[PDB]
Amino acid sequence: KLSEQLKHCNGILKELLSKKHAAYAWPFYKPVDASALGLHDYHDIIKHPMDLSTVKRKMENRDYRDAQEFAADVRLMFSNCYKYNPPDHDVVAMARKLQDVFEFRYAKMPD
């Protein structure tokens, strides 16, 4: 069972993972494979990795007790991208676009 607010969160999560946003959402689908990408400093800079597959697992496992905890993980995922990457990089542009999708729909949370 989810609260009404956690159903809204699950709706947002489904949208973030949908083909509609795939052009800019794809970097956030799975955990960053730092070694495979040659980003050998990634885990020295990012102490708390997060991605949409981990958010999905936590939602499915009823890990999130409220909307605020869900939103904290989604924003942690974007913050990690903004911390690690140069601000003019394509991946940061993709993060900004997916975060715009997230923030505008999260704002429509039922009272």
Ligand X SMILES: CNC(=O)c1cc(C(=O)N[C@H]2CC[C@H](O)CC2)c([C@@H](C)c2ccccc2)o1
Q: Name the residues that contact ligand X, by CB under 6 A.
A: 27-28, 32, 37, 39, 81, 84-86, 89-91, 94
d(CA 56, CA 58): 5
Q: Which is nearer to ligand X, 44 or 111 (CB)?
A: 44
d(CA 61, CA 31): 18
Residue nearest to ligand X (CB): 91
d(CA 16, CA 26): 10
What amino acid is encoded at 89 in this protein? H
Kindly state the smallest distance separating residue 41's Cβ from ligand X, in Å.
9
Closest CA to 25 of 64, 48, 51: 51
24 close to 15: Cβ distance less than 8 angstroms: no
Q: Which is nearer to ligand X, 19 or 40 (CB)?
A: 40
Q: Which is nearer to ligand X, 36 or 107 (CB)?
A: 36
Kindly state the smallest distance separating residue 2's Cβ from ligand X, in Å.
27
Q: Which is nearer to ligand X, 7 or 57 (CB)?
A: 57
